[PDB]
Amino acid sequence: SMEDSWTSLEHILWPFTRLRHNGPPPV
Amino acid sequence: PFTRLRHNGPPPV
Amino acid sequence: SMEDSWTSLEHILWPFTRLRHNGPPPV
Amino acid sequence: PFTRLRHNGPPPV
Amino acid sequence: PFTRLRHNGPPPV
Amino acid sequence: SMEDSWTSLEHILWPFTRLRHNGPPPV
Amino acid sequence: TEAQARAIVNSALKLYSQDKTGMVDFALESGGGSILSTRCSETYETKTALMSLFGIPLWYFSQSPRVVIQPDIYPGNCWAFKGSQGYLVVRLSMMIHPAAFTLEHIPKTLSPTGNISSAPKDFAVYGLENEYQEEGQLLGQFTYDQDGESLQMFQALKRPDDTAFQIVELRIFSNWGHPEYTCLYRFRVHGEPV
Amino acid sequence: TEAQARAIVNSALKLYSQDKTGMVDFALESGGGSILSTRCSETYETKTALMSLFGIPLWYFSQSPRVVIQPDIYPGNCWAFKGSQGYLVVRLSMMIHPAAFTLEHIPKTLSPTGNISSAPKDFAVYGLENEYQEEGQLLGQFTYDQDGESLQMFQALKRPDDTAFQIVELRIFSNWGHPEYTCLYRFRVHGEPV
Amino acid sequence: TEAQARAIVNSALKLYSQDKTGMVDFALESGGGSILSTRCSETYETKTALMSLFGIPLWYFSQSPRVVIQPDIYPGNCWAFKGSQGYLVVRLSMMIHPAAFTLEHIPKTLSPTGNISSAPKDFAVYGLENEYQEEGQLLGQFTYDQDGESLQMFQALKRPDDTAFQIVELRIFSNWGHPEYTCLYRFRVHGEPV
Amino acid sequence: TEAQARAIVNSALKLYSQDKTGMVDFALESGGGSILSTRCSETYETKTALMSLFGIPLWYFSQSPRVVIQPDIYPGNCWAFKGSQGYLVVRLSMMIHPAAFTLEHIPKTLSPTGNISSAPKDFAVYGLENEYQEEGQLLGQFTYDQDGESLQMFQALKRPDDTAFQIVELRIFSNWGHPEYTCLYRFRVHGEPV
Amino acid sequence: TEAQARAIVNSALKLYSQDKTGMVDFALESGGGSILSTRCSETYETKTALMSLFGIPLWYFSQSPRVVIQPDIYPGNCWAFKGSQGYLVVRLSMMIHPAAFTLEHIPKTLSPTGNISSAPKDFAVYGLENEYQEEGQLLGQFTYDQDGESLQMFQALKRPDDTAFQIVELRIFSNWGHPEYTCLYRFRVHGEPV
Amino acid sequence: TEAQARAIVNSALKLYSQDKTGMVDFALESGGGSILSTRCSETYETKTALMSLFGIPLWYFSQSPRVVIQPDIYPGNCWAFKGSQGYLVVRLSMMIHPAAFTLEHIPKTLSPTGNISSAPKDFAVYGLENEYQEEGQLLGQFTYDQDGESLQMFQALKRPDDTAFQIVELRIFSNWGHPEYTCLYRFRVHGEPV
Amino acid sequence: TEAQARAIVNSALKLYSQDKTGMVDFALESGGGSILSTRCSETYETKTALMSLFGIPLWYFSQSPRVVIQPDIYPGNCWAFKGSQGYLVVRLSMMIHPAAFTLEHIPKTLSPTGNISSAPKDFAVYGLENEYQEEGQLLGQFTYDQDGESLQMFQALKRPDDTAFQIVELRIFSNWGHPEYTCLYRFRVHGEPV
Amino acid sequence: TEAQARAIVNSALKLYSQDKTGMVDFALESGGGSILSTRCSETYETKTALMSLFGIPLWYFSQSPRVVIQPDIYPGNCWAFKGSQGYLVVRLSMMIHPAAFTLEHIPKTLSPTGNISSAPKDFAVYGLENEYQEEGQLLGQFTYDQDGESLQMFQALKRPDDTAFQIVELRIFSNWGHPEYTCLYRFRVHGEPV
Amino acid sequence: TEAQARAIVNSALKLYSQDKTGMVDFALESGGGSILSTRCSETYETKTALMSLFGIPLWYFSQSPRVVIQPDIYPGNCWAFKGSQGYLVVRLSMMIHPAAFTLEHIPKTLSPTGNISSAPKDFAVYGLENEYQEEGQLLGQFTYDQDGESLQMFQALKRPDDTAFQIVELRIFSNWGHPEYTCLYRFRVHGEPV
Ligand SMILES: [Cl-]
Ligand SMILES: [Cl-]
Ligand SMILES: [Cl-]
Ligand SMILES: [K+]
Ligand SMILES: [K+]
Ligand SMILES: [K+]
Ligand SMILES: [K+]
Ligand SMILES: [K+]
Ligand SMILES: [K+]
Ligand SMILES: [K+]
Ligand SMILES: [K+]
Ligand SMILES: [K+]
C-alpha cells in the first residue's frame, strides 16, 4: 500500500520535475 | 484513513 | 467521525458522479 | 491528523 | 503517512 | 512535527483570513 | 356538509403529499431510475450552481441530467441542454407497461423573466427494449402547454400488443422560444409492472 | 359556509406545513438529533447503486441511518438494514419526557413493487440514560400497520415517575415480509423539555 | 357548494405549491440570487468546532448565510449571527423595482425551547447600487410579529422615481429576546423586473 | 540474392518501426486523438477496489478507455467494458476522410487462459459530425478474426460524397465468448486529411 | 559636546526603534486592533503577491485591508482599493480619547514610477460608538502631502465633551492622481485610554 | 567636530543594524535555533483572536513559543504562557560556551495598557547536555527590570570549568504582576562556539 | 527463394513482436503479477538521482522491484538491490506448473561502462505455496552468462510430481563483479495454467 | 542460402533491438544523462498532454526537454520549443570522446499533416568543459534531412587533441518551415569513454 | 553645533529608514520584482529533508531564491546554491537603464562560525532582453569585499547606447572559501525608468 501510494504520487509528479544525475545511476 | 487495497483477482486481459 | 468525513466527501462528489442502478435499490 | 469533532451542544434554532 | 522531519543540521548561513 | 505542519497551514491561510479581536490579545 | 368538506380537504392533501399524483414514478432516481448519461444530448454550461464545503464557496458547476428525475423543482433546479432540441434516456426501476408520462415546469408566476420560454414545447416518448437499440417504439407525441398548469400529464399510446419496457427515451423537438437552451425540471413515467 | 370552508382549508394547510404534525421532533437531525452509529444494526450493503466518474466505477452507494432523522421520504430515501429485525439509537437534541413517537413509510401507491413488505412491523421504544447502557426503560410496544396511513403516531406509556431521556433506542422486532432488508423512512420523538 | 369547495381547496393547494406565495423570489439562490458573504455580518461562533487538524480545532459554525436564500426551513436550517443586530447582503437574480419582502421563521409549535426568541424582531430593507456603497436607500422598516404567522410579507415604500436595484441589504436591529444569537430562516424579495 | 534479402529485411524492419503500418493513426492519443469518455460505455467493474477512504472502498476499475489509443498492448493494457456489447467515441487529431481502421488484440499465445474469448468479435465504425448526435453515419461493419493475426486492418465503405469526420464511434456488438467483459487493446483510424 | 552628541544620537535611535513615534498605536493589529472588513470599500485586484509553499509558487493574490494596520511598509505592502475614494473601519484595542492619527506612504525616492500618485490625498477621520452606526463624530479633515515626509501625523479635533471611541472610520476622498486605485500603507490611531 | 559627529552617528546606526547588539544569537530560529515544544510551559489559550474565512469562524489564533526566537517585537508578537511562572527550552544552532543572554520586552510607551505587568521579572538560565535531562547547570539568576531599557543583557556566571551547551532552559520564576499570563518577546543566547 | 525469404522474415518479426518469446509471462505485472515487497532484498538507495521542482530539491529517485516485471529494458530501467546477492518474491497472475524462466539484461554494447558487472550471475528459482513460507521447492539452479545473449531462457527441473505454484522466489547468489549493487532488468515465468 | 538468410535476419533484428544502433547513448536519461534545463530555450506551450489519476482527467500540460533523451518517439512525444531557433544542453553519463550524434524525427508517413515542417533543419553540436562555460568547442555543423530516414546519424569533427566532454550543447538554427515551434523527438550522443 | 548635530542625526535616520539607500530597488519582490526560478541555478541540497510522505523523504532545501529579493537579512534568510559558482535571474518591476547594484551579506560579527566564507566573492551582472537568451550584455564585473561593510554598492558600466533592461542575471564566480555552498542575502538593482 505504501509503495503503491508513493508510485501514484510519483506518476503525478514525474513529467513536471527535473532529474539531475549527480553520479551514474545503477545500470 | 487512506489505504491501498490488494487485488488478488487478476486484471482483465 | 468516519461517517461524517465520508458524508462530507459524498456531498462534494454527489452532483458530478453518475448513478446507475444495476438492480432495484432498497425501497 | 484529521478528526471530526462531536457536537453535544445543540445547533442554533 | 504524513510527517515533518527534524533538522539537527544547521541551515546555510 | 505537529506544530510545524500547523504553522505551514497557518502560513498558507494567513493573508486570506480575517482577524477579529473580541478582547485584548496578550501584550 | 362540514364533515364532507373536511373529507374533501383531507383527500386533496393526501393526494398532494403522494407526489401530487398518487402514482408510482418509475423514473424517479431514488426509487431505482437511472439516467443513461451517454445517451443524453449536450448540457448547456450555465455554471449557476455554487459548491461549498464548510461554508467556503469553491466553484460554479452546471446541472446534470440526473436532476430531471429528482423531485425538487424550485426555479433553477432543472437540466439545461444546448439549443431547442435534445434527448434524454431513462432506465426505469421496473419492467412496466407504460401508461402515462408527466412533465413539470415552473409556473410563469415564479419565473424571474415573466416567461417560461426555456420550457420544452414539442416532444415525443419512445420505449426501448435494450440500452443499445437505436429505433424505439413510439409511445407518444405531445406538446407541453406554456399556458397550462405547472404539472402536465400525457397518456401513452395503447398498443394491442403491450410490449413492456424498462428503458424510455424522451426527445424534445422544440422549446418555447429561448434561443440558448431548454430547461427540463422533472419527467416521470407511470405504468403497470409485469 | 364559504368562510368556514376557507378556514378549514387554511387550518389543514397550516398543520400540513408544520411537519404534518405541529409537534417538535427532538430526533430531527437539523434540530440537534444525532445517530449513535456504533449502536445501530448492520446496514444492508448491496452493490446495485454504482456511482461513477467519467465512466470509471467509483463506489457503491448505500444509505446511512442518518436519513431516518431527515424529513425527505420519497421512495428510496430510507435506511435499509440487514435482515428483518434490527435497532437504531438516537440521541435527542434535548433532555425530554417522551410523550409520543412517529413512524413514516411510503404509501403502497408510490412503491414500485406494489407492496411495502420492507416496512417495519413490530417495534418498541426504550429510553437510555447513558450511551453505554444496554438495558433501557421500555417507553412502548407498537405495531406499524401496513394497511394504515403513511404517517402513524404512537403514545408512550404513562409511568407514575416521569423520568427524562436524551437517548432513545428503537428496536424493530419484525418487518412486513421482505426477506433481505428492512427500510426505515423516518422516526420522530415528541415530548416535553425539562 | 361541493364544486365551490373543491375549487377553494384546489386554489389553496395551487398557491401553496407555488412557494406559498405565487410570487417570484428574486433572492432565491437556485433561481439566481447570491449571498455577498464578504459584506455580511459574522456568523455565530458555536462553542464546539467541527474538525480538528494537526491538533487545532477548526470550523466553529453551524450554518452558512446561504441557507437564508434556500427554501428548507426545518428547525436549525437557518443562519445564526452573533447577538441581536446584524446584516445580510443579497444580489438578486435580476435588476428589479422591489415591491415586497418576506421573512420566515419556524412556528413556536416546532421550537424545541417553546419560544422563537431567536427570531428577528426589528428590521429594515435597503437597496444598494453597488455592494460597497456605505449608505443604502431605505426600502422599508418593519417588525416580524412573534405572535403572527410563520411566513410574513411586508410592503416596500412607494418611491416617486422608479429606481431599480439588484443588491439588497437586510438589517436586523433586534430579535425576540435570545441573548446569544439571531437565526434567519428565509428572506425573499419580490418586485418587478426592468 | 544476398542484396535482395538484405533489402527485404530492411524493408520489413522499416515498416515494423513505422507503427507496423506506415500509416498515420489519427486516433493516437499522443498525436492529438482523445477519448470522449462522457460518450463511452461504462468501464468494467472489478470485484475488488483500489483505494479505501474513510472506510469506503474506491476505484473498482483496471484500465481507463485512454489505453485504447495508446500503443502499448502487453497483456492487460486494454480497456474492459461490461458484457459483450459496448461503444467508444474518439475525437481524431484532424478532420479526415476515413479510409481504414485497425484493431489489435493479444495473440492466443500470450493469453494466460489460452484463449482470447474477451477479444471483440463483431463491430462497426461510424462517423459523427458532433459528439452528441444520436445516429452516426456507418463507415463499416466488420468482424475481428480470432484465428487471424494480432493486428487486423479493415477497409472503410466508399462513399460517393466526400464528407469528413473528426469523431468516430466504435461499436462492439459481440466478443469471442467471454461472459463478463470485453477488452480492447488498440483501435486506429486511417484516412486522408482535408 | 561629545557626550551631549552621543546622548542626542541615543535619544534619536530610541525614538526611532519605538515605532518612530514613541506612542501607542491603538489600531495596530498585533496589539489588538482589527479591521471591520465588511465596512471597507472594494479591494482593487492587482494579484501582485505570490504565495509559495515549500518553495513552490502556487498563485497570485491581492492585499487585504489588514495590511493597513501592519507595520511593514516596503513598496507594495499596502492595501489598494478601487478608484480614488474609499473607506476603512478599524476597531481599536482600547476605548480611548483619540489625540492624533498617522498616515504613512513610501517616499518618492523608493517608488519605481518616480511618483506617489496612488497615495491618499484628501481624507477625514470619524469616531463611531458601535460598529453598526452610520453617522459618526467628525474627528478631523486632513490632506496627506505628497511633497511632505513619508510619515505624517495629524491632530484630532478637540471636543469639549471628549467622548471616547473604540471604532474609527477613515474616509479617503481623493488620491494624488492615479486613475485605477489608491494604496494605503499604514494608518495609526493615538490617544489616551479611559 | 562635524566629522566626529558623523562618525558617532554612523557607528550607532551600524550597531543598531547589527541586531542592536553586534553579537551572534545562537538561539535565533532562522540561524538554526529551535524550540523543544514538549519541554515548554502551557501556552495561554484565549478565544479572543478569531480567524474567519468568508465570515465563517475558523480558528482561535494563539502565538507559538517559536516567536520568542524571532526578531519581531511589535506589541503582541510574543509568546504568552499560562500563569506567572513558566519555562522554555531552546536548542541552540551550535555547541557553545554561553557568555551572556538577552531579554527584550516592549517599552511601556508602546503598551496599550500603560504597563508591562506581563513582562518576565525573575528568571534563571540553565544549560542541558541532552534533551531528556531534567536538572541542568545553572548559568545564571537574573531579574528583568521593568523600569530599565527595552533590551537588557545579562552576563552568565563564570565557572572554572567552561562546559559547552547546545540546549538551554529559561525558567521564569515571576512576572511583573499580570494575573493571567506572561509574555516573552525575545530571548537571545550569546557565547563562543567550540 | 524470394517468397521463402519473406516468410522467414515475417516469422522472425512476428516472434519478436510476441514479447520476443511467444510465451505467456505469468509474472508480468500488467497481466496480473505482483511483487511481494516485504519479501525482497534491500534496495540500493543512492542520492545521485535528484528530482527537483522549480529548482527546489524534492526527492532522490530509486527504482522499485516492480520494474523487474515490466518490459522496458533500456539501460537504467532495472531494480538495483544492495550488495552482490539478494532475492525477489513474485506472485504470479495464475496458479501454474512452472516450465521455464527468462532473465534479460542489457547487452554490453549498450552499457555506458563497457561491462555488465552488475548483472546477476548465479541464481536459483523456488516455488512457494503461501506467502509466509520460508522454504520453497527448488525449481532450478542456473547461471546467467555474461558472454551470452541479452535474453536467456532456463528450463525448470522435471519433477515426477507436477506441483503448481502462484508464488516464486528468485534468489541471486552472485553477480558479475560489481561491488556496490546488482541490477535486474526483467524476470519472466513460463508454465502451464491449472 | 537459407541458413545465411536466417543469420542475416537475426543480425538485423539484434541490431534493431539494440536501440537500432548497437551503440551506447551517453545522453539517455535512464542511463545517466540529464538535461540542464536552465540552459534550454523556451518551451512552446501546446498543452496537448493529458494528465490522469485513477482514470480521472486532471489537466493539460506541455512536454519537458527531458523527452528529447527518452526513447519513445510516437508522434507527439517530442519537446517543442518556441520558434525555429533554440538550444538544449545535456550532461552525459560519462566523460567521453564524442564520435557521433543521432537525431530522430517521425517519418512523414506518420505525421497527421503530411509533412514534418516542425522538424529541426539546421543545427550544430558543441562540447563544453563545465556547465557554466559559454563558448564551447564546435563538434559539428549538420542539417537534418526532411527527405531522409527517420533516424539520422552525424559524424563529429575529429580533433587532433581529442579533449573529452561530459556536457554537449545542441543548437538548432532552423526548422523545416513551421512558423510556431520546432519539435525535437530524440537526440543521442555516441563516443568512447575515457 | 547642536542644531547641526540634530540635522546630521535626522538625515542619517531618514536615509536608514529609506531602505538604507534612498534608491528604488527594481528587484524588490514586494515592489514588482520576481525570480525567474526556471532560469536559476539549483538550490543547495540540505543533508536532511523537511517532510516525509508514504515513507519517502521530501524537500531537501532551506530557502527559496525568493529570499534574495526580500529585505530580511537576519542570519539564515539567504538563498544557498551548491558550490562556489551559480546564477540568479530577476525580472525587474520596470524597464530601466541600470545604474547600480547592491549586495548584502551578514557581518562577520553576526556569523555563528566567525566567518562569512559562504558570502559571494567574484560576481558579474548582465542585462537580458529575453529570459531565454543565452549570452547577456555585461553590465559589470565586481568583487564583494569580505573586509568591507555588510551592504556594498557597485556602479554599472556606462554604455554609449541607452538600452533598457527588465531582466538581469547575477553570476557568482566565487565565494569566500566555503566548500559546500554560497548564500545570497540580498541583491538590489538601481537605475532610471524609461
Ligand atoms: Cl455509501
Ligand atoms: Cl494557533
Ligand atoms: Cl523513489
Ligand atoms: K428537478
Ligand atoms: K428520510
Ligand atoms: K432556509
Ligand atoms: K493499448
Ligand atoms: K503595511
Ligand atoms: K518575537
Ligand atoms: K524492466
Ligand atoms: K522522445
Ligand atoms: K533576504
Contact across the interface for K134 and I132, Cβ inside 8 Å: no
F20 and L52 Cβ atoms separated by less than 8 Å: yes
For residue G87, give Cα distances in angstroms to C18, G66, G171, I24. Answer: 17, 13, 4, 29
Considering only CB atoms, N38 lies closest to which of O41, O85, O130, namely O41
Chain H partners within 8 Å of I74 (Cβ): 19, 28, 30-31, 71
CB H94 within 8 A of CB H166: yes
**Considering only CA atoms, which of M159, M157, M151 is closest in space to residue M187?**
M151
User: Chain G contacts of J40, Cβ < 8 Å?
Assistant: 38
Report the distance separating Cα N117 and Cα N120, nearest Å: 8
Tracing cell 503461501 back to the chain, one arrives at M130
Cβ contact, residue pair H75, G5, below 8 Å: no
Q: Which residue has the cell 504613512?
A: K104
Distance CA K52, CA M53 (A): 13
Q: Determine the Cα angle at M116 with ends M110 and M121, to 5°.
A: 140
Cα–Cα distance, G154 to G99 (Å, whole number): 9
Q: How far is K93 from chain F (nearest CA, A)?
A: 6
Read off the DSSP letter of residue G41.
P
Q: How far is the C-alpha of K37 from the C-alpha of K46, rounded, in Å?
A: 18
Closest to L68 in 3D by CA, of L38, L98, L27, L106: L27
Spatial distance between the Cα atoms of M91 and N177, rounded to a whole number of angstroms? 53
Tell me the sheet residues that pair with J90.
J35, J168
Q: How many beta carbons lie within 10 A of that of residue G81, not counting itself?
A: 25
* K185 touches K170 (CB < 8 A): no
Question: Which residue matches cell numbers 425551547?
Answer: I113
Cα distance between residue I151 and residue K54, in whole Å: 54
Cα(H105) to ligand 5 centroid in Å equals 9
Length of chain H: 194
Please state, in angstroms and rounded to a whole number, the distance separating the CA atoms of residues G77 and I29.
10
Say if the Cβ atoms of D12 and I181 lie within 8 Å.
yes
I10/I2 Cα distance (integer angstroms): 12
- Taking the centre of ligand 6 as the mean of its atom positions, its distance from the CA of residue C15, in whole angstroms, is 20
Cβ-nearest to N76 among J30, J64, J193: J30
Question: How much of chain N is helix, strand and coil, in % rounded to 5?
Answer: 15, 40, 45
A7 close to O (CB below 8 A): no
Nearest residue in chain I measured CA to CA from D4: I51
Chains that touch O (3 or more CB pairs under 8 A): A, E, K, L, M, N
- The three grid cell numbers given for residue L36, joined into one nine-digit string: 523543544
DSSP, collapsed to helix, strand or coil, labels residue H2 as helix
Instruction: Provide, as residue numbers in chain I, all residues whose Cβ is less than 8 Å from the Cβ of F5.
Output: 54
Q: How many CB atoms are closer than 10 A to CB I115?
A: 13
Q: How was this structure determined?
A: X-ray
Show the cell assigned to N163: 579533449
DSSP H or E segment with residue M7: helix M2-17
Pairwise CA distance, residues K8 & A8, whole Å? 66
Length of chain M, in residues: 194
In the three-class reduction of DSSP (H, G, I as helix; E, B as strand; rest coil), residue J69 is classed as helix
One-letter amino acid at K168 equals: V
L144 CA → ligand 11 middle, Å: 69
Q: Cell numbers for H179, please give them.
A: 426477506
What grid cell was written down for H104? 413514516
SS3 label, residue M32? coil
Q: Which residues of K26-53 are buried (b: 16+ CB within 10 A; e: fewer)?
A: bbbbbbbbbbbbbbbbebbebebbeebe
State phi, psi for O186 to the nearest 5 degrees.
-155, 140
Query: Can you read off the three cell numbers belonging to residue K164?
Result: 471616547
Q: Tell me the three state secondary structure of residue K13.
A: helix
3-state secondary structure H3-31: HHHHHHHHHHHHHHHCCCCCCCCCCCCCC
Please tell me the distance from the alpha carbon of residue I93 to that of residue I193, in angstroms, as a whole number. Answer: 10
- Whether H contacts N, i.e. 3 or more CB pairs less than 8 A apart, is yes
Chains G–J, number of C-beta pairs less than 8 Å apart: 17
Q: Angle at CA O136, nearest 5°, toward K52 and N122? A: 100
Q: Is A15 helix (H, G, I), strand (E, B) or coil?
A: helix
What SS3 class is residue O169? Answer: strand
Smallest CA-to-CA distance from H169 within H64, H92, H73 is with H92
- Cβ-based neighbours of K24, under 8 Å, separated by 6 or more: K31, K190, L109, L110, L111, L112
Q: Do O54 and A6 touch (CB under 8 A)?
A: yes
Residue of chain M whose alpha carbon sits nearest to that of O59: M58
Q: What is the resolution of this structure in A?
A: 2.3
For residue H127, the cross-strand partners are H137, H168
Residue I18: name the closest of H18, G107, G186 by CA: G107
Determine the distance in angstroms separating the CA of H183 from the nearest CA of chain C, rounded to an integer: 7
- Residue I145's closest CA among I108, I100, I90, I186? I108
Q: How far apart are the first and last CA of chain E?
A: 32
CB atoms closer than 10 angstroms to residue K77: 19
Residues of L in contact with E11 (CB under 8 A): 30-32
Residue ranges of chain M whose CB lies within 8 Å of a chain N CB = 4-5, 8-9, 12-13, 16, 20, 55, 74-77, 107, 109-114, 150
Strands H86-104, H34-35: parallel, antiparallel or unpaired by DSSP? Answer: antiparallel
Q: Which helix (H) or strand (E) holds H77?
A: none
Instruction: Compute φ and ψ for N70, nearest 5 degrees.
Output: -125, 140
C-alpha cell of residue N141: 555543423
State CA H17 to chain mean position distance: 19
